[PDB]
């Protein structure tokens, strides 16, 4: 085509989706990770995660307002990944890298899994 | 903070939101522009437009499944802007620039309004 492109558009959209999440606007699901609860937009979760994409395209699960994750999933690891989904920024640290990588593997977030593997390999 | 950032994350999210729109997945509103109907995600519309942000933060309008735009709004102009919201690409042409600018003014999409003004000024 002969379209023009606004470079900062995708980043501006994601910033506004994060502002709606912070103010709890039009969030349509609560993700339960052991004792912890996280409110989010189903569309953003599907856009970032192979696991959520599979869950919310399922004819019965698409209508659930609550999703319970596997008990082995660490709430902090999930929180860090949820923040990444809405911001592009990953808070990866020596003390959380194992939980972040295991959670990214479960959630099917291949680019996160890749950077965790590289950061671990460098420390060995 | 000490976060790492994935450069292509925002663009990848927007690409997946557009794929869900094309397949009509989790769309929660229909925008009526005269005889034409456009299905979309309320969150993406709010993230891109000052007008939709005001409409869907309203305690009564937030629950409507149908929104009717002003009869002066051109459906093609709306279609071009909706495509821009989901892609960052604006199909601006000599034959549509007036309709695109009027629609962007109504929708409160200031960056689109700005490029339309500059393209018009250059043709004068």
């Amino acid at each position: 085509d002969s379209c023009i492109q606004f470079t900062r558009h995708a980043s501006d959209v994601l910033l506004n989706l994060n502002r709606l999440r912070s103010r709890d606007i039009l969030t349509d699901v609560v993700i339960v990770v052991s004792r912890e609860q996280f409110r989010a937009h189903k569309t953003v979760l599907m856009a970032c995660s192979g696991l959520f994409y599979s869950i919310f395209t399922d004819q019965l699960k698409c209508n659930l307002s609550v999703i319970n994750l596997d008990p082995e999933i660490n709430p902090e690891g999930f929180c860090i990944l949820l923040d990444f989904m809405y911001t592009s920024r990953l808070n990866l640290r020596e003390g959380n890298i194992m939980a972040v990588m295991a959670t990214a593997m479960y959630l099917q977030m291949e680019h996160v899994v890749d950077t965790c593997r590289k950061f671990i390999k460098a420390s060995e | 903070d000490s976060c790492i950032q994935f450069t292509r994350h925002a663009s990848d999210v927007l690409l997946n939101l557009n794929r869900l729109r094309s397949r009509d997945i989790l769309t929660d509103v229909v925008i009526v522009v005269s005889r034409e109907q456009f299905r979309a995600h309320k969150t993406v519309l709010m993230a891109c437009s000052g007008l939709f942000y005001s409409i869907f933060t309203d305690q009564l309008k937030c629950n409507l499944s149908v929104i009717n735009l002003d009869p002066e709004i051109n459906p093609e102009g709306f279609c071009i802007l909706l495509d821009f919201m989901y892609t960052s690409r604006l199909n601006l042409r000599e034959g549509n620039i007036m309709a695109v600018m009027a629609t962007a003014m109504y929708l409160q999409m200031e960056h689109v309004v700005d490029t339309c003004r500059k393209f018009i000024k250059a043709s004068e």
């Binding site: 023009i4 492109q5 606004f6 | 690409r89």
Partner: peptide, 4 residues
């Protein structure tokens, strides 16, 4: 704005 750019030419993509």
């Amino acid at each position: 704005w750019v030419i993509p």
